[PDB]
Amino acid sequence: CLCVKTTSQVRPRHITSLEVIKAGPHCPTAQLIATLKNGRKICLDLQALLYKKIIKEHL
Template identity: 30%
Template structure:
């Protein structure tokens, strides 16, 4: 289950983009430290870095149902998943040496 979620998060994270258009505030009012959805419910994932308008890193999961969930980037489960994503992305970009 976790492997499927990691793969789904990788695909969505690599294909999503976001333009910051907020007026001086964070997008997430409440965050959760648990993944409470299945990979097949995912529509997009937005990772917003800290900025002048919001000092927090925000991870916003958009579900196919229209619901948005904000994940805690400091939660160990969430950090582990994204560390695995970074490792997988690095392996995809490695070119064999000649």
């Protein structure tokens, strides 16, 4: 599995591309790999991002 730790500390203006790799034998969860402007790739915590996007708006 490529992604071990996931962050929700990301600005959508910092992301140039997002790749979803579906779960498989080698890795049980989908991986959300965001490529940032600088070329760094990080793994996203989608639930945490959706939660923040819900809280920010009080829904």
